[PDB]
Design a protein around this ligand. Sequence first.
Ligand SMILES: *[C@@]12=NC3=[C]C([C])=C([C])[C]=C3N([C][C]([O])[C]([O])[C]([O])[C]OP([O])([O])=O)C1=NC(=O)[N]C2=O
Length: 108
Amino acid sequence: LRHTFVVADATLPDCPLVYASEGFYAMTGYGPDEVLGHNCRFLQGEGTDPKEVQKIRDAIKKGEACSVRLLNYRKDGTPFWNLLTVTPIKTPDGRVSKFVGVQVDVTS
Ligand SMILES: *[C@@]12=NC3=[C]C([C])=C([C])[C]=C3N([C][C]([O])[C]([O])[C]([O])[C]OP([O])([O])=O)C1=NC(=O)[N]C2=O
């Protein structure tokens, strides 16, 4: 459906974003000069459920996939509901090299 896609670099200790689709920039209001190099958590805000955030934190430290419903905020401060699925991408030696994210605005 209508979705956006990013790639995070697991070879760096805090999974910075290294690629983002045109949709991600158009959806969030942020340019590449403010997204690339940074961890995705900047989209979070006051009403983001810390329990759900922690489901992602654990799934990333454990190298598993994960799906969560998060409240995110565009650059202009307005909120929206981000259905987010993170998938680990391993090398042949079983080590996680990248994390890929599909984000869907499910505000409906
Ligand atoms: C974010 N999308 C997103 C995409 C990928 C590929 C990854 C790996 C993470 C995200 N996040 C979350 C963020 O990077 C982090 O994993 C979590 O905040 C949990 O860890 P912390 O240390 O912050 O407790 C995404 N977060 C969002 O809020 N919106 C997304 O689109």
